[PDB]
Design an enzyme around this catalytic site. Sequence first.
Site, PDB file in Angstrom:
ATOM      1  N   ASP A 191       0.871  -1.194   0.000  1.00 19.83           N
ATOM      2  CA  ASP A 191       0.000   0.000   0.000  1.00 19.83           C
ATOM      3  C   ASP A 191       0.888   1.217   0.000  1.00 19.83           C
ATOM      4  OD1 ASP A 191      -2.305   1.650   0.167  1.00 19.83           O
ATOM      5  OD2 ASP A 191      -2.794   0.849   2.220  1.00 19.83           O
ATOM      6  N   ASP A 210       2.446   1.859   7.975  1.00 15.14           N
ATOM      7  CA  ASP A 210       1.280   1.100   7.504  1.00 15.14           C
ATOM      8  C   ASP A 210       1.671  -0.040   6.570  1.00 15.14           C
ATOM      9  OD1 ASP A 210      -1.198   0.037   6.838  1.00 15.14           O
ATOM     10  OD2 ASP A 210      -2.173   1.985   6.427  1.00 15.14           O
TER      11      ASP A 210
END
EC number: 2.3.1.-
Length: 296
Positions: A191, A210
């Site tokens: 991501d 993340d």
Amino acid sequence: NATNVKAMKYLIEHYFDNFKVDSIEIIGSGYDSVAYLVNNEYIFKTKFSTNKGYAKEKAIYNFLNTNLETNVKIPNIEYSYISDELSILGYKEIKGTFLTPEIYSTMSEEEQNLLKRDIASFLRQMHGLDYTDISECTIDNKQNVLEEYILLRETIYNDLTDIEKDYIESFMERLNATTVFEGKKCLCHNDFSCNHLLLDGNNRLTGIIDFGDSGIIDEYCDFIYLLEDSEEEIGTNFGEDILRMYGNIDIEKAKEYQDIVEEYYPIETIVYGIKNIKQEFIENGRKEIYKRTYKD
Ligand SMILES: Nc1nc2c(ncn2[C@@H]2O[C@H](COP(=O)(O)OP(=O)(O)NP(=O)(O)O)[C@@H](O)[C@H]2O)c(=O)[nH]1
Ligand SMILES: [Cl-]
Ligand SMILES: [Mg+2]
Ligand SMILES: [Mg+2]
């Protein structure tokens, strides 16, 4: 608003015995999750039961903090609580400024080049890890799509319009013809958008966050956002240059991969709505199909 933070303050102090919350504010959120800055020092990511959870993400931080050699900072989990109903990960906030298009356009050409090299170097180092110890974290995007298509057929497909059906079948025809899933597999962030990349005071890459979607997957995965032409990302040229610096990778297939994932997005959105019983997502995906069909 002020009630979420009290509930989360309570959960933190309850699950982490000696932890005292002197301050706590919401620093971001997804649709399944909420993140908090605590004591101006710790990030606490939290989630309640949702098609899970934070176990993989923790195993990924633990694998990476053991195996990566890099000056780029990533989360290092000090606090974790993981149950079916609730998951919390706490770690020290990495300090810096998140990369944006606006910031990038103020950098000198050489500043930009150094950032692109920093990114290519990070990705090269991660993609190069022996991932045996995290091998449970495999992800097959092609198979996932097939399974999601089967779910569509089992649920709402027969009520879709002809235009919607044609969009989907045409996507599946493309999926079946492409070769872009047959390449090198490695550990990817998965991501890797510029809202997850942190800059220091010299506009150099200082951290990344993340790794919640990380896994062993196509090497092309980590260039999908770097190649995106949108208001949130920098531009196709940025990703191209990074791909050149990274080396040993077929740029045209990286772009094909990106283009296929972009084509899938409305269907992904529909599927998220089916799985999480949210009509709103089903309708947004369907409408997005009309928007794409009518665009020139
Ligand atoms: N500066 C800073 N911000 C962070 C850090 N960790 C998280 N954040 C902030 O918190 C936001 C949410 O964190 P992120 O890990 O992206 O979570 P998410 O997408 O919202 N959750 P999920 O991964 O479960 O879908 C980020 O956009 C960023 O603003 C950190 O180390 N430093
Ligand atoms: Cl609908
Ligand atoms: Mg995020
Ligand atoms: Mg995330």
